[PDB]
Amino acid sequence: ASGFNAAEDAQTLRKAMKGLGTDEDAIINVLAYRSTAQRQEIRTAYKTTIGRDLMDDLKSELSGNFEQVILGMMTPTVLYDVQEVRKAMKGAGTDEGCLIEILASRTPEEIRRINQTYQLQYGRSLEDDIRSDTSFMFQRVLVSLSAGGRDESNYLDDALMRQDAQDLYEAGEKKWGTDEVKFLTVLCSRNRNHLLHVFDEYKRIAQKDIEQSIKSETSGSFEDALLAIVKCMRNKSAYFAERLYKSMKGLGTDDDTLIRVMVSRAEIDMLDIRANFKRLYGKSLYSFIKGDTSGDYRKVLLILCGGDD
């Protein structure tokens, strides 16, 4: 909020938590209305102003889904990224959907810090953890991205770029699983300027847009990420929305994802994602999140959304 005081409102985060039960309806009407920076500032305050460690108290009196979400809002940015990718990183199927929605989506200086922390917090790095838990070819894409060796200068190299689209047909006809230099690099190496412009010469050299062809040559998780990168690097909020739709859709809700997206993306482009949902899925994301959730769990999300229409 405008002119915030960590300790003062932190005295309410305590007042409300006080006594068996909790006044959760007001947690949203303080915590969900601050920026993250200010939230962690609440943390500083609740430490010295109360004396217990806030994050745990939240986590020692809040129920289920409302804990993973308030938690996400209460966590600092890179640590939502590091701790998330960790969460995602093994079990069954490695929620490679998250490793697809945590790598493609961050910029190269953004991915790099996160490696340093997934090493640090735990002991051994992202790519190490990637190599077992993700496999074979799709692994490659992930390995490339987690390193972060990607061109940052917005610049079009008209020849290698025109050559690259040429190659994406070469390594277009061979499932994109041949000559492990194109599909990976061409997408996971050259700056969005050089990238989309080859995306001008593939819609030309090939008459079949790079999108379509990625789906009709390639298949599976590989395809998900290769194709994730195209969405992130053409319009990132249209992918965060494609994801949203792609969580809240279907039998039941695939909570976790929508949780990490809602929490995370909440402060970069939610009024942007939202437009690419009004058109893309002819309705609002608000209302999508309205019928597919419960009480103050939905209610705080109707605020990480930020409203209807």
The answer to whether domain 76-149 and domain 236-307 are alike in fold is yes
Return the CATH number of the domain spanning residue range 236-307. 1.10.220.10
**Domains of the chain: which residue ranges?**
3-75, 76-149, 150-235, 236-307
Contact 269, 237 (CB under 8 A): yes
Contact 10, 31 (CB under 8 A): no
User: Quick one: which of 157, 158, 182 has its CA closest to 169?
Assistant: 182
The Cα 103–Cα 146 span in angstroms is 7
Domain 3-75 belongs in CATH node 1.20.990.10: no
The Cα 205–Cα 202 span in angstroms is 5
Domain 76-149 belongs in CATH node 1.10.220.10: yes
Resolution (A): 3.0
Domain 150-235 belongs in CATH node 2.60.40.1190: no
Contact 214, 226 (CB under 8 A): yes
Contact 129, 96 (CB under 8 A): no
